[PDB]
């Protein structure tokens, strides 16, 4: 609906003034992080880029390079994440999930399953113009099996638009998933992909509906029992993403800070990735689901300048 984040444009923005506020608390053996923190988090990504631009035209240095040398810990990755082009961040951490490590598919799934069709083309055409290699090829180059198949299916944003809704297909697909799923001595996860990947959101969101009536089980739990791991993560991702991306991502955070396993990585990207998209929506229904404030969590799970930075990014809920 009306997706709104938290990070808005700073009143009477002064790119040159801020540009050298970072020159200062990046100075000598004084790395003043609370300065950078409050400022960097008080102005939209859009502007902190013309601050990065007014930085090297001013002092001839890379605001990124310099920053990422002076700060350490989760605070470093938080600020770097914060200071980079929005229309180049999703593609960024995608390259940092197909690199010298070669795992971190939790990033692949959560980015490719959550980004709407329109912005997939962005994240993917920009990737090959900044890195040179096909976004699809890099996925197909690491990911294998049905997962990589689904990823490719989702990676080319071709999902049918919201043209209408005909119960005819709704019941048609439902059973197609039903047979591919439950009614079989196996899994034709190829009816799954095409059903989760190609058909529209509206269609699918009501397909998931009557599947519950048809099967007694809801599309998601039938997945858990009919699929395993990574592939399951993707459909699981797509499914709940489809009924509500802010919800999916909202719980993407709960699971990121639960039991002695703070995945600062997800808490970082998920927070910055949509700091100005729908993070407001994220924390407002994070209360109706997880009965907790996203604010209570970040302060009661992390420390350092990290938490107060996250809090100011989180918003004011
Ligand atoms: Ca310094
Ligand atoms: Ca089966
Ligand atoms: Cl890079
Ligand atoms: Na950003």
Coordinates of N, CA, C and O and ligand atoms in Angstrom, one line a residue, residues 68 84 92 95-96 130-131, ligand 3:
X68 N 35.7 3.4 6.0 CA 35.9 2.0 6.3 C 37.3 1.6 6.7 O 37.6 0.5 6.9
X84 N 26.0 4.1 1.0 CA 26.1 3.7 -0.4 C 24.8 3.9 -1.2 O 23.7 3.5 -0.6
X92 N 24.8 -4.8 -4.7 CA 26.1 -4.8 -4.0 C 26.2 -6.0 -3.2 O 27.1 -6.9 -3.4
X95 N 26.7 -9.3 -4.9 CA 28.1 -9.5 -5.3 C 28.9 -10.0 -4.1 O 30.0 -10.7 -4.3
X96 N 28.5 -9.6 -2.9 CA 29.2 -10.0 -1.7 C 28.5 -11.3 -1.1 O 28.6 -11.5 0.1
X130 N 28.4 -2.3 -13.2 CA 29.3 -2.0 -12.1 C 30.4 -3.1 -11.9 O 31.5 -2.8 -11.4
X131 N 30.0 -4.3 -12.2 CA 30.8 -5.4 -12.0 C 31.2 -6.1 -13.3 O 32.2 -6.8 -13.4
Ligands
LIG3 CL1 33.4 -3.4 -4.0

